[PDB]
Ligand binder design. Structure first.
Ligand code: F89
Ligand code: F89
Ligand code: NDU
Ligand code: NDU
Lengths: 264, 264
């Protein structure tokens, strides 16, 4: 995509050389924003094929409040195997915080339901947020949330969402996070009889791993193509009832994929 | 300041009327980003007078872990008055989450000292965060955190910071929040022997109240002036040991103030 490729070139031209956790080294920049008007089409990168099944399954997985890769397996999604433990468990990550943020007094708060109700009953609210950044349980998480905080906004029957990503594997992860939250907005908009609006993406440590230079240059030389369109062929009775078949996407004529190693 | 003034112009050009809870009506936009190179100067608005006195005191107050107006009062700062209960208690707001976010297993986390230990031993970390958005105790707070989430970054011996403000009263609160965090960056940096880099501001519902238009236009019709300079005259043994007096602001020649009624 236009913005996606500009953000990539930017890391190359401005990124600072940093030594990271994995000891691989990256080119980093701090703070950056991208806006995506959903009216123009789904933000699924075209300069590289991306499987919507991957994206669509992990998201449904979160909305389920599940933190065990079992399900993700029964559908060939593996990006979460490396971190899950012996029993395929990752701890109180994303799903757990979205669906059951544990209170100190021993209760649970369902941010999604709350958010659903706020959208339906009080769209002007400026407290329509949901964050996975639970300081009290980070140590228990197999890994700290990258996309850790997002907020919904409504104006003229349009539903927007701004995502704050503290850490961002520009080449590997970004394309997926974008599509995922873009897909969630659509779902929320459907269950709330709203029209989709803007998807604002904000990042903290935005980086490009040193051993991704080649794949990047390659991708940087490809011409982007019109964005596809997302079709949801059925409206479940809730936001926790969508399924893989429900979504469809036309107009996706991407360039072939580009293989790259993941940094552990 | 240019950034602040351009922001105000932006909300006026691309804003959209919205009805807030105080039923006052705002003109808002969603998502925005501005950077301030603390090296260029201290970001205290000049197109309108501000009192560093108050800013400092509220900040020292946060760093204390105090959520009771008594302190603020013993110092003539009264902005929080409106929201304090009969005992000057605001609930587990800012200061409390910073110094003692309560975990579910009876623990309490001091996000401030943590960040200080990280800026010292693992500055390359991508998870140097402080969150005030504690979903668990949100119902006990007098107000839901506006400046609710921030992140630090280090590069070339310079400390940077990015703040996510879910809600922003562009005319009233913004000026103070900016100067405040900028003030925190200089302090952190001093404790860690770093140099000040950039302060990046990112916002959610960035609005202007209806009763603030004539004033925002008056201010908007003013020429900015050179940013003042911040001078610390003592390096305390800890970030929690600063006193009002250690701070010295230089060359601040602002225009006259401008009164506008706060929205309850
Ligand atoms: C260093 C690093 N670490 C991570 C750790 C955990 C992650 C969890 C999720 C995501 C992003 N979301 C998805 C969601 C689905 C898939 C993958 C990623 C990528 N992927 C195939 C590639 C599919 C494609 O190219 O379409 C793979 O095995 O990489 C998936 O099935 C990224 C990371 C990163 C990441 O991007 N970088
Ligand atoms: C609608 C709305 N509500 C708020 C509620 C609580 C706030 C708490 C802090 C701040 C921002 N930080 C400071 C820090 C110091 C001062 C004030 C604000 C503004 N202020 C006025 C005096 C306000 C008063 O003391 O009554 C001044 O110009 O000195 C202060 O002393 C803003 C709000 C808002 C805000 O900006 N807007
Ligand atoms: C982390 C991530 N996740 O774990 O769920 C995701 O969805 N997208 C990412 O971009 N992402 C990446 C960023 C970074 O390179 C690493 C983790 O490193 P650290 O925790 O920030 O030190 O994963
Ligand atoms: C809230 C504030 N604070 O609580 O400390 C601050 O620092 N500055 C602000 O700009 N801010 C404003 C934004 C908005 O107009 C209200 C909060 O309203 P809700 O979003 O309904 O809670 O105060």
């Amino acid at each position: 995509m236009k913005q996606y490729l500009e953000l990539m070139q930017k890391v190359l031209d401005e990124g600072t050389q940093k030594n990271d956790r994995t000891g691989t080294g990256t080119l980093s920049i701090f703070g950056h924003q991208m806006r995506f008007n959903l009216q123009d089409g789904f933000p699924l990168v075209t300069t590289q094929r991306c499987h919507l099944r991957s994206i669509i399954h992990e998201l449904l997985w979160f909305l389920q409040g599940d933190t065990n890769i079992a399900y993700l397996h029964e559908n060939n999604v593996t990006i979460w195997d490396e971190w899950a433990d012996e029993n395929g468990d990752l701890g109180p990550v994303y799903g757990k915080q979205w669906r059951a943020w544990p209170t100190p007094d021993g209760r649970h708060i369902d941010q999604i339901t709350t958010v659903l109700n706020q959208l339906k009953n009080d769209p002007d609210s400026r407290r329509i947020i949901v964050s996975a950044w639970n300081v009290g349980e980070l140590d228990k998480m197999a890994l700290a949330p990258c996309h850790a905080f997002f907020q919904f906004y409504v104006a003229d029957g349009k539903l927007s969402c701004q995502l704050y990503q503290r850490s961002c594997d520009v080449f590997l992860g970004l394309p997926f996070n974008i599509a995922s939250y873009a897909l969630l907005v659509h779902m929320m908009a459907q269950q709330c009889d709203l029209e989709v609006g803007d998807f604002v993406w904000t990042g903290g440590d935005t980086h490009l791993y040193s051993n991704h230079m080649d794949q990047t240059h390659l991708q940087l030389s490809r011409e982007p193509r019109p964005l596809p369109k997302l079709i949801i062929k059925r409206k479940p009775e809730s936001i926790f009832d969508y399924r893989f078949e429900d979504f469809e996407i036309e107009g996706y004529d991407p360039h072939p994929g580009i293989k790259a190693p993941v940094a552990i």
